[PDB]
Ligand binder design. Structure first.
Ligand SMILES: [Zn+2]
Length: 380
């Protein structure tokens, strides 16, 4: 196959020592991607040829969860095809691999010195630390960011990969990868992103994709849509209802301490539990989960049964960690393998719904609060 790297991949010369640090990072990236491919393709549940994924946590007609075999989606098949090409010719794919030591697009971080010390690679890359970032921010956002990042290893280690992976893809098994990838406090400065604790208590990182360490633009002329990485969300937070053009996949790593520790919702934009009005080349979607109505929309997540979920384009989704033992645990959260399948077409923006009652209620946003989502049409 012929690999074309993204435009911001600049071939670099490393010393013999540096190359060994790059090589360990690359080797663990390949393990992560091979395991990702196996997680897509290995049959589970009642699916014969690929993994069984949740696609709606509440189907309005059945009143039940709705699933699909994940490789039935052509965009997922294409991710699998591109991962196979990477894994078949890793030396060629490596031309597009960059440790992002001097990455200019935006800041990338390491959670803490403790996490940085997990690998010589992470130490050499020497990203700014999130503990420093949140100490400077201060306030309630900084307090949440300190709680997550000072306890990052404990939070991200409370995982069980033994049922749906054949190697430990967590920070325990791939420490160079998890310590060296660029972590992003995506919501710390976003005033629309819900509570201060959620904003400080949220991170993601990208291993492969247009902003990852592996940045392949095309393989054999096909645009690579795959964007693969990980997310971490602090316990006792609610990620507000949100939506976006790219289809998305979540694989839950966290082993929960109670069945309802980590709840998620995914419902298609036209689900009859919501109210939709056509806008201008889009839809206004009103969500009223008040007075307990939200509860049936949310399902529990765990690394055994409800481990895999696929979000169709513009599907409304949310991740909720306020219930149950979130009121008794500590140093916990929701940690996932995260991916999008079409990262190079349409609008990549992660869009947030907003409170029906206005901006004054953003900081308490949670599933029971009425919300408005302004969806845009995508190009088929
Ligand atoms: Zn999403």
């Amino acid at each position: 196959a012929q690999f074309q790297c993204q435009d911001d991949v600049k071939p670099t010369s490393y010393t013999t020592e540096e190359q060994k640090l790059v090589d360990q990072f690359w080797n663990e990236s390949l393990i992560y991607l091979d395991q990702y491919l196996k997680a897509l393709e290995t049959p589970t549940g009642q699916c014969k040829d690929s993994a069984q994924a949740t696609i709606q946590t509440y189907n309005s007609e059945t009143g039940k969860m709705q699933t699909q075999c994940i490789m039935k989606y052509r965009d997922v098949e294409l991710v699998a095809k591109h991962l196979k090409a990477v894994l078949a010719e890793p030396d060629k794919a490596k031309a597009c691999f960059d440790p992002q030591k001097n990455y200019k697009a935006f800041p990338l971080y390491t959670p803490s010195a403790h996490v940085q010390n997990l690998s010589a690679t992470s130490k050499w890359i020497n990203r700014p630390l999130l503990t420093d970032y949140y100490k400077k921010i201060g306030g309630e956002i900084g307090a949440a960011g300190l709680e997550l990042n000072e306890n990052f290893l404990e939070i991200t280690s409370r995982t069980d990969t033994t049922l749906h992976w054949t190697k430990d893809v967590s920070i325990k098994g791939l420490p160079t990868l998890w310590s060296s990838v660029g972590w992003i406090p995506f919501y710390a400065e976003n005033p629309n992103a819900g509570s201060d604790r959620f904003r400080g208590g949220y991170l993601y990182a990208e291993v492969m994709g247009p902003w990852g360490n592996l940045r392949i633009k095309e393989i054999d002329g096909e645009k690579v849509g795959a964007e693969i990485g990980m997310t971490a969300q602090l316990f006792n937070t609610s990620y507000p209802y949100h939506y976006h053009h790219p289809q998305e996949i979540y694989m839950t790593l966290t082993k929960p301490q109670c069945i309802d520790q980590n709840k998620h919702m995914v419902m298609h934009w036209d689900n009859n539990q919501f109210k939709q009005k056509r806008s201008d080349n889009g839809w206004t979607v009103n969500i009223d989960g008040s007075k307990g109505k939200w509860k049936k929309w949310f399902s529990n997540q765990d690394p055994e049964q409800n481990w895999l979920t696929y979000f169709e384009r513009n599907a409304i989704h949310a991740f909720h960690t306020l219930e149950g033992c979130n009121q008794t645990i500590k140093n916990s959260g929701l940690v996932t393998v995260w991916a999008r399948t079409t990262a190079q077409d349409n609008n990549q923006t992660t869009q947030l719904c907003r409170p029906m009652t206005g901006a004054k209620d953003i900081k308490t946003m949670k599933p029971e609060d009425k919300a408005i989502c302004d969806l845009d049409d995508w190009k088929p």
